[PDB]
Amino acid sequence: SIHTKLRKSSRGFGFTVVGGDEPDEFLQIKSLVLDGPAALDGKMETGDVIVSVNDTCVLGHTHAQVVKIFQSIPIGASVDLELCR
Amino acid sequence: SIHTKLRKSSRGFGFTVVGGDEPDEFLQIKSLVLDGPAALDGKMETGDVIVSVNDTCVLGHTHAQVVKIFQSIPIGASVDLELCR
Amino acid sequence: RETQV
Amino acid sequence: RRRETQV
């Protein structure tokens, strides 16, 4: 279990996700963006499974729902992430 | 995200699991067994998604792989579980 | 697929 | 290569 908190920038949170192509498959961090919030923070790493976002469990959500909740965060607001590796 | 520890009895841990179809699908708790370890502990609930078992993440493991992890725990020993609601 | 452990 | 979305 890994817990972090990232601030939303105009360029995003600084990471890419994969998975969630059907409601039964979990999501994963595919890449970290150079000089992005995820990377300066240094706690997330490629292959990490996304468990929850702002206390909301995302294991069971589609890749589309999760992208939506990440893009739904206003610039400057922060997000609490729980990841498993 | 919830964290419990259960003691292994001859009768098992007292819960059943569904899911884990393919290695990118997740596993869930279907039922709790009357007065078994899990139910008496009172923390686990049906629908709960299994994230990890004893420090190690099970989200990338199949249904049989995780069942082998629970069955390979000797009686009297206890597992640490992290589940998400 | 429901296995009792 | 599966779908990879930046956020």
Listed resolution, Å: 2.2
The owner of tokens 């599966």 is: D2
Which residues, including other chains, have CB under 8 Å from residue B44's CB and lie 6 or more apart?
B2, B4, B15, B29, B32, B38, B81, B83
Residues D6/A16, Cβ–Cβ less than 8 Å: yes
In whole angstroms, give the CA distance from residue B71 to residue B29: 16
Residues B67/C3, Cβ–Cβ less than 8 Å: yes
Which residues, including other chains, have CB under 8 Å from residue B17's CB and lie 6 or more apart?
B27, B28, B29, B30, B50, B63, B66, B67, C2, C3, C5
Token pair listed for A70: 């990440």
- Give the chain A residue whose CA is nearest to the CA of B82: A1
Instruction: Give the 3-state DSSP-derived string for chain B, with helices as H, strands as E and coil as C.
Output: CEEEEEECECCECCEEEEECCCCCECEEEEEECCCCHHHHHCCCCCCCEEEEECCEECCCCCHHHHHHHHHCCCCCCEEEEEEEC
B60 to chain A: which residues are within 8 Å by CB?
49
Which residues, including other chains, have CB under 8 Å from residue B51's CB and lie 6 or more apart?
A1, A49, A51, A59, A84, B1, B57, B58, B59, B82, B83, B84
Among A52, A70, B35, CA closest to B13: B35
Beta bridge partners of B84: B49
Q: Which domain does A75 fall in, by range?
A: 1-85
DSSP 8-state assignment for residue A45: -
Q: How far is CA B53 from CA A6, A68, B68, in A?
A: 27, 30, 12
Residues B47/A59, Cβ–Cβ less than 8 Å: no
Which residues, including other chains, have CB under 8 Å from residue A51's CB and lie 6 or more apart?
A1, A57, A58, A59, A82, A83, A84, B1, B51, B84
- Beta strand segments in A33-75, E: 49-53, 56-57
DSSP 8-state assignment for residue A26: P
The single-letter code of the amino acid at C2 is: E
The single-letter code of the amino acid at A28 is: Q
Residues A6/A39, Cβ–Cβ less than 8 Å: no
- Counting the structural domains of chain A, the total is 1
A60 to chain B: which residues are within 8 Å by CB?
26, 49
D1 to chain A: which residues are within 8 Å by CB?
none
- Give the chain A residue whose CA is nearest to the CA of B20: A24
Per DSSP, chain A holds a count of helices (H) and strands (E) of 2, 6
- B39 close contact with A: CB closer than 8 A: no
CATH code for the domain in which residue A38 is found:
2.30.42.10
Residues B15/B61, Cβ–Cβ less than 8 Å: no
Residues A84/B27, Cβ–Cβ less than 8 Å: no
